[PDB]
Design a protein around this ligand. Sequence first.
Ligand SMILES: OC[C@H]1O[C@H](OC[C@H]2O[C@H](OC[C@H]3O[C@H](OC[C@H]4O[C@@H](O)[C@H](O)[C@@H](O)[C@@H]4O)[C@H](O)[C@@H](O)[C@@H]3O)[C@H](O)[C@@H](O)[C@@H]2O)[C@H](O)[C@@H](O)[C@@H]1O
Ligand SMILES: [Ca+2]
Ligand code: NA
Length: 699
Amino acid sequence: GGIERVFTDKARYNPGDAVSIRVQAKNGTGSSWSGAARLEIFHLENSVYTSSQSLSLTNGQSTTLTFTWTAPSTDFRGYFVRIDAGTLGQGATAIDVSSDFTKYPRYGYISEFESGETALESKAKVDQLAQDYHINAWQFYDWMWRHDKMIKRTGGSIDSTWLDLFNREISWSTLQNQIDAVHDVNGKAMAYAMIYASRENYSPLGISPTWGIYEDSSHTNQFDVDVGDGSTYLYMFDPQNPNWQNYIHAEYIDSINTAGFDGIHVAQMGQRSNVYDYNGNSIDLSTRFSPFLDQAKSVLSANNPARDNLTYNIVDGTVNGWAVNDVSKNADLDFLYSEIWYLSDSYNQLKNYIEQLRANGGNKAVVLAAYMNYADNAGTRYEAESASMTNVSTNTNHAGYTGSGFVDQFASTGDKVSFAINAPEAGYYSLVFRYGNNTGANSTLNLYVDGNFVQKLYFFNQSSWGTWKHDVWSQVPLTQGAHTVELRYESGNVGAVNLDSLTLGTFDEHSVRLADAMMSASGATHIELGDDNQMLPHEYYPNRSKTMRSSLKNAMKDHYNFITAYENLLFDSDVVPNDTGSQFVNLTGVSASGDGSANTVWYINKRTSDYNIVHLINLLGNDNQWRNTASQPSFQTNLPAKIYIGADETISDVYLASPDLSGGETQELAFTSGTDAGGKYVSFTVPELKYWNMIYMLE
Ligand SMILES: OC[C@H]1O[C@H](OC[C@H]2O[C@H](OC[C@H]3O[C@H](OC[C@H]4O[C@@H](O)[C@H](O)[C@@H](O)[C@@H]4O)[C@H](O)[C@@H](O)[C@@H]3O)[C@H](O)[C@@H](O)[C@@H]2O)[C@H](O)[C@@H](O)[C@@H]1O
Ligand SMILES: [Ca+2]
Ligand code: NA
């Protein structure tokens, strides 16, 4: 398919906006090509536009066609887009018509703001997410100077740079440029801010400890957060206290008006117990965010209804988890957001949590933060003891190492380890080192790639020498083919390490497709893409300890088209579970389950006013954790399926759309029904199941 890309200028359109569908093509079949480009746009199963254009290309040549469309007056509609060019190829994209991003958030992030970033580089990184995945809002992570003094001013004047709490340079022009670029794609820019945090030494800013929350009832220890340099701390505060609300809401408003943000992403540290105010009163923090969020929304909307967007992080998401009910039910948020840790590990546990959220929020959209392959050091491993070491030998004395051993006593000047690696395709590669360090402090080593120094690299001190870690990395660009990565213990390097391996930090395509399918099926979206086409590997968004390869980038384009086009079926306000009916799916040859059981095909049972919807999630040959890496599922071809229904439900037609299958185009299938011992049925053959099928049946 030498139809290379299909996309749109903007990332969400309004009803009646012009819409420019672009089509990048390129002939590479030896000799000229003449024919047409047949654009066809669907709403679920109904073609609603069709158009054609002449196209001829010599061998080798490229062009970009524009097709122009008018978004239909019906607000809040997702559309599939087909382009066919006969033997040249095909491609696809989706279009979302919504006056408001908060009905169908597709949430990304920006976390870098270097002053070396030209306005053009800024526009290019934003355009890529907008075009490839239809992002409609970006969370700006760690843009602020201080958590309690977000825009840094000298007098009245705004400082053109400032240093954030890990000492990064944040550039105001870069920041402003990004927000404009976001705004070009009719994007929205959400500002990160904590609900309760000041930085240290907050008194001369006129913040009062009397507004604080405390570990005890003598106001002797304020809750805090050691960021870990001995100076830099977050101190926590009472969200219901009016003076705190006043102080911090003011900086919220300052950010909207001064920086041009469209709303605020309010965060929190999560759960805390046996909590007191300054005066000594015991208080349940879990119920206290809703009042603050309510008042937040109220001043944001008075300040400016066009830029009054709001959400809150419900941290450690699970069914009836901490502050889960109070926030989701009573907090005046525009869409719900939750960071999942280790209390919803099964695909099913997580399906049930999203379900609770949708229920409690009145089917208002849910986004999850769920960092994939977090625990796992995934990607291609290059063993340190297979490699080329100057002045150091292998050992096997401390345990937990991988392959045959590791390199010891990387202690002394002129020590060296060199990895002869190969990079399948051009692009960014995460260099992830597994190490030991029990020196007593940080150890350092210098990182050379292809004879050039990249970085000094700090290895953290650990409990024992038997304690291995892989949380030291460097992202570097690479041409396809052989390359040399080496560490040198040079002059200025300190301490010592054991070295176990180099891994090319890579997200695992299989886990991720499944995790996303699961979430979208269940009714959610996943903040997972940001900056220059990075995927989110950690809670600290600037972490680049893992990269997607072309393969997963393709999968996500397919996926994000999918949850854009069929968004009315996944996320609309009347898309509810279809649970009360002993409902059952029968599959010939393969065992199924409705509770996401390892090594099965998981049917999930949802419905709307007009459609009966089954999702199938191929867990064949794979376990039931959502977060861990995975094997390629057992691909099923020509698969007989049987679906049961209520006696008052007759099926006009039956459709199956899947992102694993023709970019997610809908296909109609052959089917009749009858009746038998286990209720009234309907049946058909599933042509292919790979990762995720969305069967939707019109009634
Ligand atoms: O020390 C080495 C260490 O470096 C990196 O991790 C840095 C730390 O990341 C996080 O702390 C920074 C983070 O703290 C507050 O927000 C916390 C958290 O809030 C959640 O609501 C949100 O969803 C998260 O995205 C967010 O991180 C501040 O408000 C924020 O400004 C600040 O950025 C994390 O809490 C620490 O544990 C980390 O050390 C590397 O990524 C890490 O591997 C390494 O160990
Ligand atoms: Ca090893
Ligand atoms: Na898994």
